[PDB]
Design a protein around this nucleic acid. Structure first.
Lengths: 126, 171
RNA sequence: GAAACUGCGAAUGGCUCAUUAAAUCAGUUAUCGUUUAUUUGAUAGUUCCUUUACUACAUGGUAUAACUGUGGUAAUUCUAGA
RNA sequence: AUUCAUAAUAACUUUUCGAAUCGCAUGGCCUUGUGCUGGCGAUGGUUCAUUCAAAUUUCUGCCCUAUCAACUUUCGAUGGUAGGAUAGUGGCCUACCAUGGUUUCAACGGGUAACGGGGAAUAAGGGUUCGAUUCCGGAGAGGGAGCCUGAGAAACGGCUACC
RNA sequence: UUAGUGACGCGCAUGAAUGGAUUAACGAGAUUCCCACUGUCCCUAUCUACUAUCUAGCGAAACCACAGCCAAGGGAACGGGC
RNA sequence: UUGUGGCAGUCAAGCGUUCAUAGCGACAUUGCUUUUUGAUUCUUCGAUGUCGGCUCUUCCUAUCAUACCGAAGCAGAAUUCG
RNA sequence: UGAUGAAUGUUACCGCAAUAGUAAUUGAACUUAGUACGAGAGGAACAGUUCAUUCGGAUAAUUGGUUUUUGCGGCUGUCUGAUCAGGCAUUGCCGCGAAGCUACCAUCCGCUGGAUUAUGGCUGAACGCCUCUAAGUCAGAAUCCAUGCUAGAACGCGGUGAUU
RNA sequence: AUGUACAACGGGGUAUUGUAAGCAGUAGAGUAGCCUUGUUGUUACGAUCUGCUGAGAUUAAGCCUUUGUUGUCUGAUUUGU
């Protein structure tokens, strides 16, 4: 079995207890009680009716539901390899990064290479 | 019922055909993002805790976030939203869904684990699927490894070896 | 080099003549009363904002798809979950 | 012919544009540095003009009907002021105000086997009739209403609803 | 639909100031139908005050051969009596 | 009292393709009933409240249906007779 | 029709059960079965299951109705200096409204054994056969009587307790 | 006829209704008056709104229950195998 919710009061409708209504547009309403039913037929607004759950929740009364959204104070904690880099050697080369004389000497080599490049290019142009 | 559970760090996933109707009555009347007890559903899941991610009910209509009901509804959905892909730019569309409350109407419930309990799970925790792709961007690789601003991502590159015939290559 | 993201275009064509009797339409004017993608011709020394450390410019951050797989409906160019 | 083009003072902006894009080719200075400079392109990009358009707009012109002579204005009909909206003028809409405006020189209403025109048959001339129909402009996507995307649609071989 | 209305007319026995045929309006006039409405009804239920009811007190009347159980019989042919 | 009204029998010329009787059964005839309508005038004219409907019970059966059965010109269904 | 009630030695309790009354009724659907049967056309039935019609007897969890709970709130007019709170309005009016009553407008329940008719029969003579019949005898119905149900003879009875 | 006694009140619960009066408000169509003319300016009046308030009220009279309180508990008549 199941329990349901009055359209008007928003109340548990234990089985059998209460009425049901089926408008021509196929909207199925349920009513715990003829009180709610009669108000509905009067075309009242539960948000204006005071004892109703809609008014309750629209005026923010009994607000023990929500508390807050949690936040984690840390990082993802994965400086992992990219599946083709061998993380051990990856960290080894990351540590070799400081004391950058290796890359500096490669730059100096390609630098004298650019020197000789302009030189030999001018030579061929001559 | 079925529990399509996932462990996102291991990247693993498995369906579990559940009974113990009352140990899923616990799951009844539950929203998305909420976390209930593995032990409460199953001592095989003792100590674990999941998070109700969502699920498909009968007629395959998924659970959508934010609507706050168990019953099905027809929403005039639009782009940038679950449960509808547009086959044209500008197309809004009316589709039927089920909402963000849990009940017997559901058939498959999609769960994600946030904590690993005391025991181990056969198809989730004992296994771990790898990262199918490596980062294709320079700085993403560089920060993923923690190298420097200048540590030559070009040579820290990923190389994924595959053989066409006997000729093999990393592409 | 499929698929997919993206950008374009899908507002043209084609069909019919139901509507409509100062309305469309035809010639004839104006926009000194307006939009105009696209093409075509020209066109952005001045962007550090307690502007001194507040900030990489041999250059910065974010997914997300496709895909991997779990999959759910009897059915949908149905779609969620990781 | 302008309060035009255009320029400057003073501020406004939740902040607009001012290339983090891509293919080829690789060229030159040496201060011998991956220093500095360099070409042919594609893409996109603020403004102005242009072009294909688009929307409004001036004068003239439409078949039969008086067994239709008064019509329009409640709640826009005519004008004006201010404002809103529009991409833009303007009753397009509102607030307020004057009460006007069309009419036998046939208003208004009805009917149309009426979309209109360029044109077709037919003839000495005059003309009568037809013209949905290959070209031009309009309207529509089963009837209606609405709207997103977009430069451009009130799109329908696109969405939403009702019938 | 033996009703109501409109027509027909060898009208047992229509009919012209023994007034005929219409006739707007009017009618606590007779009649039919439709809208609404309804406990008239399907099908009854419930409530209220005053009664009835019981008490205190007051206190009639109609009617009366004698009185007051049925069946059949016969009998002035339908008896409370035999 | 029961002509007449109603109901049921006897007989069986004939109908029923052929065959009187499965079913009908003319001409003739014997009975029953009192729900008609007459006939009569016994009671009732110093009053038996006078049609119908409504309501409500009870009774008869000459049984419409229902229960069980028999017959058929009853293949089955449907029907008819009892 | 219901309701009391003197008298039985008193009073109280438990019972019996004469007699009288009586009630349950009909249909549909699925299945049997598109079977039987029928050349074909068409087209059954018993058992079984689920449902309903009519009638009855209770009950008020649910729903509906009713509302002098004059319980809560509101509304009009008027009076109480105004407010607060109240009176009057033949129960002033409206909305809600419990309890109680109540509804085929709601719900629940509504028994099984014997003897029998009609009819069909068993053996069986008269009538040396034959025959359901004459003696005997079987099954058989919404019938009849019992089971069951209602009241309990107020002049029908019993058992038991305490009896100044 | 002195008790797991009874009764009237009180309490609690359950139900009904719909958020009491009183106070406050930098709420309030606004209209008048104040001046040190604000930036809540202040003052008089002003339906109504919001908070205290699912508050308050009623609740067996034929609802339930009470560790509570306060009381009551020998008047008449008749009866014999």
């Amino acid at each position: 079995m199941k329990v349901e919710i009055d359209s008007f009061s928003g109340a548990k409708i234990y089985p059998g207890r209460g009425t049901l209504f089926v408008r021509g547009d196929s909207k199925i309403f349920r009513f715990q009680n003829s009180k709610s039913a009669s108000l509905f037929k009067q075309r009242k607004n539960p948000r204006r009716i005071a004892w109703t759950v809609l008014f309750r929740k629209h005026h923010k009364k009994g607000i023990t539901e929500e508390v807050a959204k949690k936040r984690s104070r840390k990082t993802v904690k994965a400086q992992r390899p990219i599946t083709g880099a061998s993380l051990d050697l990856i960290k080894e080369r990351r540590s070799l990064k400081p004391e950058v004389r290796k890359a500096n000497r490669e730059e100096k080599l390609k630098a004298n290479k650019e020197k000789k490049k302009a030189e030999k290019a001018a030579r061929k142009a001559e | 019922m079925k529990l399509n559970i996932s462990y996102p760090v291991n990247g693993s996933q498995k369906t579990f055909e559940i009974d113990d109707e009352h140990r899923i009555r616990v799951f009844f009347d539950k929203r998305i993002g909420q976390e209930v007890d593995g032990e409460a559903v199953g001592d095989e899941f003792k100590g674990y805790v999941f998070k109700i991610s969502g699920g498909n009910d009968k007629q395959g209509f998924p659970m959508k976030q934010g609507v706050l009901l168990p019953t099905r509804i027809k929403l005039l959905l639009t782009k940038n939203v679950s449960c509808y892909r547009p086959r044209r730019d500008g197309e809004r569309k009316r589709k039927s869904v089920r909402g963000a409350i849990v009940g017997p109407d559901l058939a498959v419930l999609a769960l994600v684990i946030v904590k690993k309990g005391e025991q181990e799970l056969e198809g989730l925790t004992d296994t771990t699927v790898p990262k199918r792709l490596g980062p294709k961007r320079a700085n993403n690789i560089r920060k993923f490894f923690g190298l420097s601003k200048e540590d030559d991502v070009r040579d820290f590159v990923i190389r994924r070896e595959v053989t066409k015939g006997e000729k093999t290559y990393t592409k």
